[PDB]
Amino acid sequence: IVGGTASVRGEWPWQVTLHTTSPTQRHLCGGSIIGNQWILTAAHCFYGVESPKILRVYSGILNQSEIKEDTSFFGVQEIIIHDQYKMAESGYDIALLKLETTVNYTDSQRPISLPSKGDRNVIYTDCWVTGWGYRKLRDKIQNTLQKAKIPLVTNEECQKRYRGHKITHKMICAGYREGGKDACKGDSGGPLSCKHNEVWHLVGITSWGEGCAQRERPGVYTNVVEYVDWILEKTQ
């Protein structure tokens, strides 16, 4: 996260850190708890991942330094990548992880609702992107979970910023005209969470953009509302 601030314990309890364990253990991507055995994340995170055997999902983490050899985690039983996915920038950047066991919900780990049926035209004004990603192009994964409030940009405006790409209704964009706050490498797969009527909804999945926090280059997110039927079919 560029231009963010440190989160506190229990602030984003649906946020998880997805680690790989090979050839070293490191944070790969963010994700969001959406059910008792389900993480919603980005398909592009699984580049070069041979099978679910090397993954670990950690919930209830504030600081990456908290993760030691005795820290509890969930194994990943299955990786479900959207059948149309090929690359983040070409869309369908969505995946589900089915966990090996159920998440017991507490103040530090609980699900986030999907955008609700009937809310297709809601105007979200309180949206936040979170993660342990880079704060600049040549950085590293950050210790403390960062947050930044980012305004949504219309698809028509987003397309004008990305004339070389197809910005579709299956994408949603968020950024400041003058940049300064954005998601970046390692935030991918995590949530764009919007609070409406005092309830958080998972509106986007961090996916891609041109650089990080550049002026007139908003972040591009998977538009979760356009995949609710796909998610429900996979998690039913």
Ligand SMILES: CC(C)c1cc(-c2ccc3c(c2)[C@H](N)CO3)cc([C@H](O)Cn2ccc3cccc(C(=O)O)c32)c1
């Ligand atoms: C410019 C540069 C530093 C860079 C930037 C981004 C990036 C991420 C989010 C974001 C933006 C940019 C926009 N500012 C809005 O939100 C991503 C990357 C990643 O190499 C991509 N990647 C490709 C394969 C792979 C496998 C796992 C995780 C990631 C991963 O995305 O972390 C993988 C790089």
